[PDB]
Amino acid sequence: TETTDLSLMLEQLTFEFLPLLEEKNLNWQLNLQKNVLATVDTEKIARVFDNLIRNAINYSYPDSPLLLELVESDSIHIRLTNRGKTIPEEMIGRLFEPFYRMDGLGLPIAKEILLASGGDISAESKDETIIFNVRLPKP
Ligand SMILES: [Mg+2]
């Protein structure tokens, strides 16, 4: 039953990804609150975030920011926003359905992981913006 410092994790992950932002001239815009702890396996959640960031890099328009926000309120909230082609509402509703991408990677599995961790994930898209919202329980 590990405790993960999500603030440290995302500070490190965003730094490590810097070389991968160069090809499309992306930049981080970070709003990461500090000392945000969650009861979740560290490597498991880091692998979920790695996949969400890689999807955001691949989705993104060039010359654009990737906005990553970490807030502690009644739950812990992580939001990753990129600019890109708007995802239509029909598609948004199916992003977490297994094998829909065969009808971004890893989205059904992200939801399975987060639900079993006592949290969840959702997606929104409007006005050339694509947003993934992750919730985790506060200890
Ligand atoms: Mg391992």
Numbering used by the authors: 210 to 312, 323 to 358
Question: What do the authors say?
Answer:
VanS is a sensor histidine kinase that responds to the presence of vancomycin by autophosphorylating and subsequently transferring the phosphoryl group to the response regulator, VanR. The phosphotransfer activates VanR as a transcription factor, which initiates the expression of resistance genes. The VanS sensor kinase is organized into several structural domains, which include a periplasmic sensor domain flanked by two transmembrane helices, a membrane-proximal HAMP domain, a dimerization-and-histidine-phosphorylation (DHp) domain, and a catalytic ATP-binding (CA) domain. Here, we present X-ray crystal structures for the catalytic and ATP-binding (CA) domains of two VanS proteins, derived from vancomycin-resistant enterococci types A and C. Both proteins adopt the canonical Bergerat fold that has been observed for CA domains of other prokaryotic histidine kinases.
The structure of the VanSC CA domain was determined by molecular replacement, using an ensemble of homology models as probes. The crystal asymmetric unit contains two copies of the CA domain, related by an approximate twofold axis of symmetry. The two protomers in the asymmetric unit are highly similar, with superposition yielding an RMSD for Cα positions of 0.25 Å (0.74 Å for all atoms). Metal ions also figure in the crystal packing of the VanSC protein, with 3 Mg2+ ions being situated in two different lattice interfaces. In particular, helix α3 occupies very different positions in the two structures, being positioned much closer to the nucleotide-binding site in VanSA than in VanSC. Hence, it seems likely that the ATP lids of VanSA and VanSC can adopt a range of positions, and crystallization of these two proteins has selected for two different conformers. The N291D VanSC CA domain was also less stable than its wildtype form, but we were able to express and purify sufficient quantities to perform binding studies. The mutant’s affinity for TNP–ATP was decreased relative to wildtype; unfortunately, the ATP competition assay could not be performed, as protein precipitated in the presence of high concentrations of ATP. We were able to perform equilibrium dialysis experiments with the mutant, but these assays showed no evidence of ATP binding. Finally, it is interesting to note that our two CA domains are derived from two different “flavors” of VRE, namely types A and C. Type A VRE exhibit inducible resistance to vancomycin, that is, cell wall precursors are not altered in the absence of the antibiotic; in contrast, many (but not all) type C VRE exhibit constitutive resistance, meaning that the resistance phenotype is observed in both the presence and absence of the antibiotic.
